Design a protein around this ligand. Structure first.
Ligand SMILES: [Zn+2]
Lengths: 38, 76, 75
């Protein structure tokens, strides 16, 4: 589903696979000092 | 069925699971293999942070699916 | 000898080590205490990233030295 990252608002282009998106999300979550929900 | 859990350093953990296994079960398996306490694990798949009480099938996780694992340090 | 490993979450980990211990050995000790796999640990001392095959004495790390531990975001 996700069309943009809920943490950093980067837009997810259609060329990105689900794996790419999950990987991006993981990095954004890890970089945040607090636990985030979305 | 086999799934993969990928860490941020690129390491891949392979797990045998059932579609009805809960996310907590999965974290416990990760602990068994890697020694990481579940409370320090966060899992991501299909645009979602996976919740402990839900099942793999709830998230459409299937054979050879790749989940992403993020670790947290203890706080305090 | 004792060294201190600080995290940005405000935790200080105290470790008992020898000067001849390798960084790999130190990471294993941190895993024992904190449950973080060594491949996910980055250790920094005096602005320098510590390499696994080198020893504490190679970096002039001495009693009551403070290292920093940060989690890796990339391989
Ligand atoms: Zn992001």
């Amino acid at each position: 589903a996700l069309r943009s990252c809920p943490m950093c608002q980067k837009e997810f282009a259609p060329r990105l696979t689900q794996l790419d998106v999950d990987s991006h999300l993981a990095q954004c979550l890890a970089e945040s000092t607090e636990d985030v929900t979305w | 069925m086999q799934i993969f859990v990928k860490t941020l350093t690129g390491k891949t953990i392979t797990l045998e699971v059932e579609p009805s296994d809960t996310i907590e079960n999965v974290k416990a398996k990760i602990q068994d293999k890697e020694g990481i306490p579940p409370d320090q694990q966060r899992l991501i798949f299909a645009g979602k942070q996976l919740e402990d009480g839900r099942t793999l099938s709830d998230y459409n996780i299937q054979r050879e699916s790749t989940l992403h694992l993020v670790l947290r340090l203890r706080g305090g």
